[PDB]
Design a protein around this nucleic acid. Structure first.
Lengths: 127, 205, 49, 51
RNA sequence: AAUCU
């Protein structure tokens, strides 16, 4: 939902911000073994899965991607982009969440703000 | 002691045992009797697996030597005589096919009739404490256990025995032969063994 | 990967394992099983000698 | 400011001094695996090129 | 109200 445009004097400050917020439960070391069990279930070795969120994600992504033939490598790359976190230093005004940083080229300028509100659902930590 | 275990066993056993000892990160000279125990484990597993082939059902039909035909199916699949990666790969493939449970530590065999793993052990000390050691290590288990003793008496879970008694007798004959050929050399005393020696070895450049 | 064996060893080993597990409950029949086990045997006769 | 002839004045022997001061009170294998680069860049050579 | 490359 777009809104009006406001011209004004804007100050941007440089900060570390999230591109991908990742899954909050997996810690970025469990996520890789999850990716391994989903895509390469026989080549994982000794690692059992412990947490309940791991099993939930595993069964979900395992019944979704049942008999696909896209490629295991690309499926793994995209699951990484889904699950693991990724940061970057950028100049920022306004919102710092990831849904507001993918559109920072459109919401914020040198002289102008563009009101905008993404469409999906929002996490309550941000709120 | 290394000389004896090189003399007695055929070179496949000692080859794979030295491979496994190198993979462990140990020194064959600082730790020796472990090498002989590993050789014995390898040999009894090979004998437990060899002289066994499968029928349309399970419950192995035994042969002197396998007949040449499509019926190549062994009842037993060997796990421990392998590298770490290939062994865990066999395990995970099995667990993902039959929906079985995944162990935490590597078993030694897999049996198709009753569809479960087996963890053979061989001990100088008699059974019923090593059994519970094996059990509380193998927690939440379906894998059968079948432990031997140098004296001539064995043990199992549920009083279950996964093969003939004649093959057990063969294992026991080989084992007693080993023990009281050891007694001739006088190295039986050194079998009360445990992992020792400081493996935190100094770095040297 | 990680290992000390030659590549052919791991390759033929995994071939045998997948053959067994896929014949037991699945797709592989007896003819394929015997034929690929024969090929594995010849690979061994080529590597070890 | 910029520095002139920065890469010609800087000597590896000063780097060896620095290394031996930074590895002060460390294991000798570490002191001896970090001391080899400034050595080998103090006895270095240079290919001249195509001609 | 934040500490992850």
């Amino acid at each position: 939902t777009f809104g009006p445009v406001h011209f004004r004097n804007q100050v941007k400050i440089r900060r570390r911000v999230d591109i991908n917020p990742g899954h909050a439960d997996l810690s970025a070391k469990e996520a890789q073994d999850v990716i391994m069990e989903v895509v390469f279930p026989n080549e994982v070795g000794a690692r059992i899965l412990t947490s309940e969120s791991q099993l939930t994600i595993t069964k979900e992504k395992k019944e979704e991607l049942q008999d696909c033939k896209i490629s295991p490598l690309m499926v793994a790359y995209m699951l990484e982009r889904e699950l693991v976190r990724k940061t970057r230093f950028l100049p920022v005004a306004g919102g710092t969440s990831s849904v507001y940083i993918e559109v920072l080229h459109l919401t914020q300028g040198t002289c102008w703000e563009q009101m905008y509100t993404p469409g999906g659902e929002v996490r309550n930590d941000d709120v | 002691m290394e000389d004896f275990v090189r003399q007695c066993f055929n070179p496949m056993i000692v080859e794979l045992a030295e491979k496994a000892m190198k993979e462990y990160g140990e020194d064959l000279k600082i730790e020796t009797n472990k090498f002989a125990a590993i050789c014995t484990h390898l040999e009894v597993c090979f004998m437990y697996s060899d002289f066994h082939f499968i029928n349309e059902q399970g419950e192995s039909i035994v042969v002197e030597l396998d007949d040449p035909n499509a019926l190549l199916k062994h009842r037993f699949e060997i796990i421990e005589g392998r590298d770490r990666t290939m062994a865990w790969t066999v395990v995970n493939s099995i667990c993902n096919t039959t929906g079985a449970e995944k162990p935490k530590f590597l078993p030694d065999l897999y049996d198709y009739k009753e569809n479960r793993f087996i963890e053979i052990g061989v001990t100088r000390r008699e059974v019923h404490i090593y059994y519970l050691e094996k059990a509380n290590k193998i927690k939440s288990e379906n894998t059968h256990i079948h432990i031997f003793s140098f004296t001539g008496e064995e043990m199992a879970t549920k009083a279950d025995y996964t093969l003939d008694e004649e093959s057990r007798a063969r294992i026991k004959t080989r084992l007693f032969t080993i023990r009281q050929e050891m007694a001739n050399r006088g190295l039986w005393d050194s079998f009360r063994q445990s992992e020792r020696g400081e493996e935190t070895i100094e770095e040297r450049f | 990967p990680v290992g000390i064996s030659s590549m052919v060893e791991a390759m033929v080993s995994r071939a045998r394992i997948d053959a067994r597990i896929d014949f037991e409950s699945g797709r592989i029949k007896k003819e394929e099983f015997a034929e690929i086990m024969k090929i594995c045997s010849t690979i061994e006769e080529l590597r070890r000698q | 400011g910029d520095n002139t002839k920065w890469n010609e004045n800087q000597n590896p022997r000063m780097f060896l001094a620095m290394i031996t001061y930074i590895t002060k009170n460390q294991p000798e294998w570490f002191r001896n695996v970090l001391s080899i680069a400034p050595i080998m860049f103090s006895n270095k050579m240079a290919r001249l090129g195509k001609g």
